Design a protein around this ligand. Sequence first.
Ligand code: FE2
Ligand code: FE2
Lengths: 171, 171
Amino acid sequence: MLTYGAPFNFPRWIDEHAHLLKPPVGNRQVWQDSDFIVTVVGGPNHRTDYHDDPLEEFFYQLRGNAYLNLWVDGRRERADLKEGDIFLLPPHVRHSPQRPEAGSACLVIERQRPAGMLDGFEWYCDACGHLVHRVEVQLKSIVTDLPPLFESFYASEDKRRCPHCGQVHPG
Amino acid sequence: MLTYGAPFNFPRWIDEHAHLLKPPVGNRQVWQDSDFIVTVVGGPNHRTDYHDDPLEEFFYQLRGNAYLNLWVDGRRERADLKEGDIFLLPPHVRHSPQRPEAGSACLVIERQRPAGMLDGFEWYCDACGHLVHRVEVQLKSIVTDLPPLFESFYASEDKRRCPHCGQVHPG
Ligand SMILES: [Fe+2]
Ligand SMILES: [Fe+2]
């Protein structure tokens, strides 16, 4: 059986879910209970966290532009997702998606994580560059298991305190 | 490190590889040695086989139209991939992609199969509908491990002989 339904027009599906791509949401998963996690991510968004995904992440910037703040070879690189770009992120490259444009839409595709394969969410210090805080999480909900993580980092000056220079991250 | 390179424009990449989407190829994998197998499939193509994929298969018909001959609930259903459609095929639904249009382009995304997870390739009889032949294969090469399977079915009248009505499949 076609568990996930029949083919349907993607542009128009993105149109009909525009208002849920705008904040306060941003995310919208296409099919539920599937192995491939297929999401459309709009803008504008608020992210200061770096994601440490134990599996690959496919990107296709369908509308508008966005960029990924990265940690590549110990440096703070930036990878731009201009409209029409596709990209395959290798496992565990830290990345912080910035989506400044309202009405943008990026197809993001990932894999359900097997039990014991944890996602990481880290913040780094603007001053000294050291790791400020890391939460590891057995991700079940690419859309709803992240904000409590975030809220609790923003709510805790201690979690935000850099252990190398003491500067409290802004959150 | 960005093992799979930097973002790049997908439309133009499809343009530059047009002539390899035309026969005798049809397939073109985007990145090598990745967990997500990301391919562009053009047309026109020749398929009489049904694929039995042990994992899910994501489709995004970027250009032109195509369709999937299916076996749903014991019947021969057809799922159309019109330009702009996306689709998520559940594991093990038998499917036979028909791509009649030259210049069409479909984004197909799959997963590297773990050792011991086999793909199936089956043919069915036009007359009686029974299974004519099935080859199971530990797929390493979504692009190059299939044609010898096919050639050997086309070359063997015995493999093509229906075991229920004796009609020899056309191949
Ligand atoms: Fe610091
Ligand atoms: Fe038959």
